[PDB]
Amino acid sequence: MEALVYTFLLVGTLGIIFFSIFFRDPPR
Amino acid sequence: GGRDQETTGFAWWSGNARLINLSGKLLGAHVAHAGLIVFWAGAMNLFEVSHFVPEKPMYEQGLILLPHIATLGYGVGPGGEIIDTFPYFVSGVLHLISSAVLGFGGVYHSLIGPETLEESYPFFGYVWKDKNKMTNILGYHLIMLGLGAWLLVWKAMYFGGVYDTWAPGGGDVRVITNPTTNAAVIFGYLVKSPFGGDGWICSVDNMEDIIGGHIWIGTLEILGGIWHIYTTPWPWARRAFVWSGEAYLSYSLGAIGVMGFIACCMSWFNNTAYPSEFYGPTGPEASQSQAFTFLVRDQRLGAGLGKYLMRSPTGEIIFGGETMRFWDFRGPWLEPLRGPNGLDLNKLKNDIQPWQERRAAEYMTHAPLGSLNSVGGVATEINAVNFVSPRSWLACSHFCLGFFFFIGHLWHAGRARAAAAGFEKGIDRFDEPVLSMRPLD
Amino acid sequence: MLTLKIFVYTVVTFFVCLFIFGFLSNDPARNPGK
Amino acid sequence: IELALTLVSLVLVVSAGPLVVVLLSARGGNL
Amino acid sequence: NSSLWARFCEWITSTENRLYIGWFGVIMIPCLLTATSVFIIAFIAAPPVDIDGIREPVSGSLLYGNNIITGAVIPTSNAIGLHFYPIWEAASLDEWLYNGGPYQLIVCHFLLGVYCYMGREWELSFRLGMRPWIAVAYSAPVAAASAVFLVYPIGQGSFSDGMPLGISGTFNFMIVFQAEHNILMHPFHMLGVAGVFGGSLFSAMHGSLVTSSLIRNIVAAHGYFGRLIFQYASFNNSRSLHFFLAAWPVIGIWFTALGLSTMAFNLNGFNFNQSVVDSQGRVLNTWADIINRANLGMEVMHERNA
Amino acid sequence: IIAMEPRNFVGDNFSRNTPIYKVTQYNIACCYSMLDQVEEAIKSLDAAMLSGFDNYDQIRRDKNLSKARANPKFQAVLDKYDEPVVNWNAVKATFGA
Amino acid sequence: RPFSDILTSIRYWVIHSITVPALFIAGWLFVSTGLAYDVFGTPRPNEYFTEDRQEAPLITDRFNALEQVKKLSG
Amino acid sequence: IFTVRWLAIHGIAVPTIFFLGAITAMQFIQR
Amino acid sequence: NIYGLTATALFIIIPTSFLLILYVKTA
Amino acid sequence: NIYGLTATALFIIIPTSFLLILYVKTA
Amino acid sequence: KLPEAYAPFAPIVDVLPVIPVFFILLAFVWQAAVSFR
Amino acid sequence: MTSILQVALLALIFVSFALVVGVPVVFATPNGWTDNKGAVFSGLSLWLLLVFVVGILNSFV
Ligand code: CLA
Ligand code: CLA
Ligand code: CLA
Ligand code: CLA
Ligand code: CLA
Ligand SMILES: CC1=C(/C=C/C(C)=C/C=C/C(C)=C/C=C/C=C(C)/C=C/C=C(C)/C=C/C2=C(C)CCCC2(C)C)C(C)(C)CCC1
Ligand SMILES: CC1=C(/C=C/C(C)=C/C=C/C(C)=C/C=C/C=C(C)/C=C/C=C(C)/C=C/C2=C(C)CCCC2(C)C)C(C)(C)CCC1
Ligand SMILES: CC1=C(/C=C/C(C)=C/C=C/C(C)=C/C=C/C=C(C)/C=C/C=C(C)/C=C/C2=C(C)CCCC2(C)C)C(C)(C)CCC1
Ligand SMILES: CCCCCCCCCCCCO[C@H]1O[C@H](CO)[C@@H](O[C@H]2O[C@H](CO)[C@@H](O)[C@H](O)[C@H]2O)[C@H](O)[C@H]1O
Ligand SMILES: [Fe+2]
């Protein structure tokens, strides 16, 4: 079942990247 | 007698950039550089002749230029044996003296001469923004290159012959008579795939194809030069290009880098225009020679087949072991023993010739393996032997030069486009194109 | 897999043609301020 | 003896290299 | 101007998009999407590959009992070599996977994508009015990737020599490369490592100087640098300093990529073996000789004759 | 409308000038011709050519501008901005020799 | 003290021109005469393998190492 | 005449030239 | 019981994270 | 491998939740 | 090898191919003479 | 005529060195060639004809 844990971690990281790209905080 | 940094705006390290507008200085620079090229050619030829012994094959002492003359077929006997050395000496000395003449001309034009040729010599003058004169110069030089190609064809077909490595009983000088002028085969190479087993234009096998291609390219070059002399660029051509000196340099850099990469691959793989007898065996050739010599020795001593043979994914019979990656190799000493279905057993069982055996031995011993420290053999070789195949030198040097000239294309094309647009010096700090855009959220 | 080969070929050719014609559409650079 | 000839030739070349520049600097030549 | 072509062109070239597309983007985007999709799917689940082509499959897929640090996309099988191997040339999908086509697919699409990315970098630089040559700086990692993935297999004549798309695969590739060729004892790799170390040093030093100077100054930082060591007149203006920062790592990586490509044609690094010899002919070991012993160990260990 | 042209405008497709610039200045050149001001009509159409009014058929064919067409400098500027593709005179002269 | 004045000084030129070659020849003699081998202990190319020891030296001693090296040396 | 700059430069240089002479003579040693 | 673990984990991650994203956007 | 699973789960949950709570408080 | 008629001039030949790499250096010293203006 | 070849060749190197040194000196200096065309013209002419002499002498042997 370790495989599912690895995929969960990778997909979560990809989600963090996506959110950092498209949902940026406007300056000040 | 150069300009100042303030006058031209270019520092010393960007000095030659001051010559863009000036024509006489640029012309002298070009002529002097051509003289330098020819000087190096002559000097290298003389030195290589001075350090050459006809007894040994040329690839054993690091020879890179003399193999070219040998390929043209000067002082070369059957099997690659050296007959006379005078042709090389005469070629070198002629090159060197022509270089002297070119250097004198370039120095005269660069130092004491009209800095701009437009005012006094309208025929030779030009302006980068001009289009007709650029086409005229291009046509002149296209005609020159076509004449060179036709000179090669004339030499191959008349007044001697070229060293064909596919002649029966080893290579020898031969006179071409019926070059393959069919357009279909000529352009099949241009359309051929570049991947394993196809190789694009690097898969030419017969000198017939070489001569036919040179005929076609020379005729096309002459016609194109005549066309460009009398023609002006089309409206779309003037709309898709940047017409300035640096842009011309950029396109030339891109083209020459691509040709450098292509020549590197040709040197590493091709063996027809580069006979193995002079340059030495290629990597695949050395591996196949290893396998073939081992099979011959095993067959002699013991006296598909499990001994060093196997079946390729397609189905043909191929040499076994790690050599299977080179199953597409073709060579004069291996072609006769190959049947329609790859290697046929009866051929090696009966059809064997001594010269093939000794050629295979001499090729397997001299594999294209070496070190930058001029020590042959694998990197983990305990002892020391001096050998590095000239093919490796050519391939590495020309790959590096092609890559660097591609980078040069990138740089110069970017700079030329920016200068044409008018913002190469920097942002105007008043009307930033970014400021005229909405904020990005 | 002839069908897949033709599908890949048509999509690749579409992309390449759009790329080439897109560059062909762009008008030349120029300096208004000169 | 050939090594001596090579050394002398190298000295001649490396002396002729900057000889022209030095002579032009000594005179009123354009540099 | 409502024609389909007109509006599609306007959308493609518009800077209003969240991420600039550009025409280079046309080839850039789909290629990378294909590469990443195939890479993810192969890494997650895929059958073993016969890397060496003697019917000894090598598991490299995550689902087949291996970890992240060990999972990798095995390169193309040794049997195919340089032949072009898409899906439609394989006898069957299972055979395609067993031989190792997805690596070839991924590498081709990835190389096209990175080249198109360079192109779009230039194109947007031209659009915004900034100077054009940022692509030149980008040419270093692209050159290194091309040398690792394409040029070296071409030199060795087989696609199995390309870097496996994994971590432990990368370590295996590096170790095998050291075994075959002395990458460590080659001047171009020395220049590359010098470039990397100098880039780290310059980044750290520049960050420290600039962040310390920013108080509420550049003259103070210049004096600080000029007094810490003995080069007072060093990088007087920001233009020269930042150009030097750009230039050092880029040249280093250019040189290491060129070194790798040079070795692709079997032009190895320095070979200092039996360089020191005493009187009447004995061999005195030097550090180069212990390095040679290690190289011999790796070389003789990786080559599975059987 | 020419007066309000922005300074340092880089178009989305690298135009460097607003699309209405070329058409409106071609119109102003036409109206100058209608005002009997050929000497400035040639300059107006020269600047229009500089702006990238790539279309060439109407300027040669349009009767409305024919009044200014009589001036030789109009044909001179047309030639240096629309060069004959094939030098018929040159090839004929070479054939004669 | 700016560098130009010291560079153009005749006294500087003469003293350095007489001293530099002295140091150069001092180093030349220091290595050629063999004093370097004795002082720093590097064996000459013809005593690496003493007749009693045909293999590389090995110490196997921490405190009582002096005469051990004496035995290994020479 | 005895400034710290003088001391630094001489301390660096004197061993430097000594070692350069030693090394160049050392290279001619017959193996 | 791998299916139960994965189903439970998905049900705890996807919806709660979904709510958190919206709340972060609101403030 | 239960210790690994629990350690990993704790490392994902406690710190990321910690940060999320702070950010929610800030906005 | 080189014909006997030019055998004694072997050494100068050995120096000729190295000549071109000097030219760039010449340029540099010229720029040094001109004081890098 | 091996000795004749040798002496002519020596003269070739001497004259080539002299020309290589003089050429830049005469052209670079202001007003140094418009008043000295004859000297350089004679030098290059004698250079060419003695090169031809060396060539024909070699052709003899
Ligand atoms: C591409 C190079 C190039 C170009 C564009 C020019 C252009 C010019 N030169 Mg220069 N010149 C060159 C090379 C070049 N020359 C070289 C190599 C030399 C050394 C020999 C000279 C020496 C020279 C002198 C001394 C003078 C000029 C002058 C001139 C101007 C008048 C035309 C002329 O020379 O009459 C040419 C007249 C001829 C009778 C020659 C025509 C017959 C020749 C021999 C045909 C050769 C062509 C053939 C294809 C060569 C191929 C060689 C092979 C290796 C490829 C003109 C601007 C004159 C000038 O006004 O000064 C600025 C002048 O006084 N040139
Ligand atoms: C081979 C490459 C090459 C070539 C052909 C040129 C050519 C030229 N450069 Mg460029 N340049 C180069 C490399 C090159 N440069 C490099 C590498 C640098 C960086 C250091 C520069 C930096 C630079 C600057 C900063 C400037 C030039 C300028 C010039 C022009 C005038 C030269 C001058 O003032 O001479 C002065 C005269 C002498 C030094 C004496 C002559 C010495 C002779 C030719 C050499 C002696 C040997 C030779 C064999 C003699 C001929 C013998 C033969 C007749 C048999 C000229 C067109 C200048 C120019 O015109 O710009 C507007 C200028 O401002 N260059
Ligand atoms: C009449 C118009 C004309 C012609 C014929 C040429 C011809 C030439 N120009 Mg161009 N040029 C022109 C106008 C012209 N130019 C103008 C108007 C300008 C601007 C002012 C230039 C600027 C220019 C530059 C900047 C340069 C040239 C160069 C050259 C030469 C190319 C040498 C080379 O590398 O070729 C490579 C290919 C070959 C050598 C293959 C051709 C093989 C031969 C020569 C053909 C057969 C003839 C031969 C004599 C037969 C006997 C063979 C054997 C027995 C010896 C070539 C002779 C280049 C050069 O190096 O010149 C010295 C160069 O750098 N030209
Ligand atoms: C190296 C020498 C050289 C150079 C620099 C040029 C340069 C030029 N030529 Mg000339 N030409 C040459 C040799 C050369 N030609 C020769 C040898 C011939 C005889 C066959 C011609 C015949 C010729 C004609 C008949 C015409 C030109 C034209 C042109 C101009 C148009 C742009 C262009 O080249 O096409 C750029 C490339 C293309 C448009 C693509 C088609 C070319 C092939 C089929 C590409 C195939 C492979 C490629 C990878 C795929 C690219 C995709 C494509 C859709 C862009 C340009 C100034 C035209 C012009 O306006 O000048 C008057 C023109 O009408 N040339
Ligand atoms: C024939 C091809 C060609 C030509 C005619 C030019 C001409 C020019 N270039 Mg371009 N360039 C080229 C190729 C060419 N370049 C290539 C291949 C590259 C890729 C590296 C570049 C990269 C380049 C840059 C980045 C810049 C120029 C600039 C310039 C201009 C000033 C020249 C200069 O820098 O002063 C002369 C400078 C020197 C002599 C310094 C030499 C330093 C190098 C590193 C010496 C290396 C020598 C070494 C032994 C070679 C080893 C090779 C080995 C790796 C195989 C001038 C218009 C400059 C400019 O302002 O353009 C307007 C500029 O900024 N060029
Ligand atoms: C401008 C200039 C420049 C450049 C230049 C150049 C590049 C030039 C070139 C030049 C050249 C390029 C020249 C040449 C010359 C040559 C000569 C002068 C020759 C002679 C010869 C001889 C003498 C021979 C002899 C012999 C023979 C025949 C063979 C072998 C044997 C013998 C040895 C006997 C620079 C940039 C640096 C800077 C500025 C100035
Ligand atoms: C000798 C030879 C041969 C043949 C050859 C031939 C036939 C060749 C041809 C060639 C050719 C025929 C080539 C061509 C090329 C082309 C090119 C290289 C082009 C390019 C282009 C470009 C790059 C473009 C671009 C653009 C863009 C993209 C932008 C927009 C516009 C345009 C479109 C302009 C044979 C095999 C027989 C033999 C061996 C070798
Ligand atoms: C043919 C022949 C010949 C020829 C000759 C020639 C061609 C010559 C040339 C020559 C040359 C062409 C020379 C050159 C030289 C150079 C040099 C000698 C250089 C030096 C340099 C330096 C010393 C540098 C320094 C520096 C730099 C790097 C820059 C920065 C700073 C400094 C200052 C540090 C003769 C007559 C012999 C004889 C017969 C044969
Ligand atoms: C920058 C401009 C530089 C121009 C340099 C030109 C270089 C071209 C010179 C190549 C050498 C040609 O010189 C040579 O041609 C003759 C053939 O035509 C040779 O003649 C010989 O060639 C072969 C020798 O194996 C034989 O097939 C011939 O029967 C034999 O007569 C001469 O040995 C020599 O004179
Ligand atoms: Fe900064």
Q: Are B345 and B357 in contact (CB under 8 A)?
A: no
Q: Are E120 and E25 in contact (CB under 8 A)?
A: yes
Helix (H, G, I), strand (E, B) or coil at G2: coil
For testing contact with chain B, the best of E151, E267, E293, E296 (most B CBs within 10 A): E267
Angle of helix E4-13 versus helix C2-25 axis, rounded to 10: 80
Helix (H, G, I), strand (E, B) or coil at F86: strand
Query: Which amino acid does the sequence have at E151?
Result: V
DSSP string, chain E: --SHHHHHHHHHH-S-SSS--TTHHHHHHHHHHHHHHHHHHHHHS---B-SSSSS--B---GGGT--TTT-EE----TTTTTS---GGGSS-HHHHHHHTHHHHHHHHHHHHHHHHHHHHHHHHHHHHTS-STTHHHHHHHHHHHHIIIIIHHHHHT-GGGSPPEEHHHHHHHHHHHHHHS-STT-HHHHHHHHHHHHHHHHHHHHHHHHHHH----HHHHHHHHHHHSS--SS--SHHHHHHHHHHHHHHHHHHHHHHHHHHHTS-B----SS--B-TTS-B---HHHHHHHHHHHHHHHH----
Q: Are F22 and F29 in contact (CB under 8 A)?
A: no
Residue B424: closest C-alpha in chain C:
C31
Extract the tokens encoding B163: 């060293």
Q: Are E79 and B323 in contact (CB under 8 A)?
A: no
Distance CA B131, CA B239 (A): 12
The answer, yes or no, to whether any atom of ligand 4 lies below 6 A from the CB of B224, is yes
Helix (H, G, I), strand (E, B) or coil at B345: helix
Residue E61: closest C-alpha in chain A:
A3
Extract the tokens encoding B71: 């390929």
Ligand 5 centroid to Cα of residue B8, in Å, is 18
Distance CA B347, CA B292 (A): 13
Nearest-by-Cβ selection for B240 from C24, C30, C31: C24
Q: Apex CA B321: angle with CA B315 and CA B325, to 5°? A: 65
Q: Confirm whether residue H10 is marked as ligand binding.
A: yes
Q: Where are the alpha helices (DSSP H) in B234-353?
A: 235-240, 245-269, 276-279, 283-302, 345-350
- For C1-34, b where at least 16 C-beta lie within 10 A, e where not — what string? eeeeeeeeeeeeeeeeebbeebeeebebbbebee
Q: Which residues of E touch B415 (CB under 8 A)?
A: 132-133
Q: Please indicate whether, in this complex, the C-beta atoms of L9 and K12 are within 8 angstroms of each other.
A: no
Distance CA B136, CA B124 (A): 10
The DSSP code for B231 is B
Tell me phi and psi for residue E49, to 5 degrees.
Answer: -115, 145
Q: Which residues of B touch L55 (CB under 8 A)?
A: none
Beta-carbon-side half-sphere exposure of residue B150 (alpha carbons within 13 Å): 12
**C-alpha separations of J6 from A2, B351, E174, J1, J3 in Å:** 12, 73, 35, 9, 5
CB distance from C27 to chain F under 8 Å? Answer: yes
Give, for C31, the enclosing helix (H) or strand (E).
none
Q: Please indicate whether, in this complex, the C-beta atoms of E284 and G46 are within 8 angstroms of each other.
A: no
Ligand 3 centroid to Cα of residue B138, in Å, is 11
The answer, yes or no, to whether any atom of ligand 4 lies below 6 A from the CB of B221, is yes
Q: Are B68 and B114 in contact (CB under 8 A)?
A: no
| Contacts of B among chains (3+ CB pairs under 8 A) | A, C, E, F, K, L
CB-based contacts of G23: which residues, under 8 Å, 6+ apart? H14, H17, H18, H21
The minimum-distance atom of ligand 7 relative to the CA of B212 is 37
- How many Cβ contacts (< 8 angstroms) between chains E and G? 11
Sign of the four-CA dihedral B178, B182, B183, B187: negative
The minimum-distance atom of ligand 9 relative to the CA of B95 is 3
| Burial tier of E88 (Cβ tally within 10 Å: 0-12, 13-18, 19+) | middle
Distance CA B39, CA B95 (A): 7
Q: Which residues of F touch E129 (CB under 8 A)?
A: 8, 10
Say which experimental method was used: cryo-EM
Distance CA E7, CA E27 (A): 19
CB distance from B441 to chain A under 8 Å? Answer: yes
**C-alpha separations of B274 from B162, B206, B270, B400, E227 in Å:** 12, 12, 7, 21, 61
The answer, yes or no, to whether any atom of ligand 3 lies below 6 A from the CB of B403, is no
Kindly calculate the radius of gyration of chain A based on its CA atoms and give it in whole angstroms: 13
Distance CA L26, CA L40 (A): 9
Q: Are B131 and B244 in contact (CB under 8 A)?
A: no
Extract the tokens encoding B303: 């006296």
Nearest-CA distance A1 → chain I (Å): 7
CB-based contacts of B277: which residues, under 8 Å, 6+ apart? B57, B79, B80, B165, B171
Pocket test for ligand 6, best of K4, K9, K16, K28 (most atoms within 8 A of CB): K9
Ligand 7 atom 2, closest CA: B213
The answer, yes or no, to whether any atom of ligand 3 lies below 6 A from the CB of B30, is yes
Distance CA E82, CA E150 (A): 10
The answer, yes or no, to whether any atom of ligand 4 lies below 6 A from the CB of B220, is yes
Torsion angle in degrees (nearest 10) through CA of E74, E78, E83, E87? -40
Kindly calculate the radius of gyration of chain E based on its CA atoms and give it in whole angstroms: 25
Closest of F45, F40, F7 to residue F24, by C-alpha: F45
| Burial tier of G8 (Cβ tally within 10 Å: 0-12, 13-18, 19+) | exposed
* Distance from the Cα of residue B417 to its chain's centroid: 30
Give, for A21, the enclosing helix (H) or strand (E).
helix A2-22
Q: Confirm whether residue E83 is marked as ligand binding.
A: no
Pocket test for ligand 7, best of B145, B162, B190 (most atoms within 8 A of CB): B190
Closest of B93, B105, B94 to residue B30, by C-alpha: B105
Kindly calculate the radius of gyration of chain C based on its CA atoms and give it in whole angstroms: 17
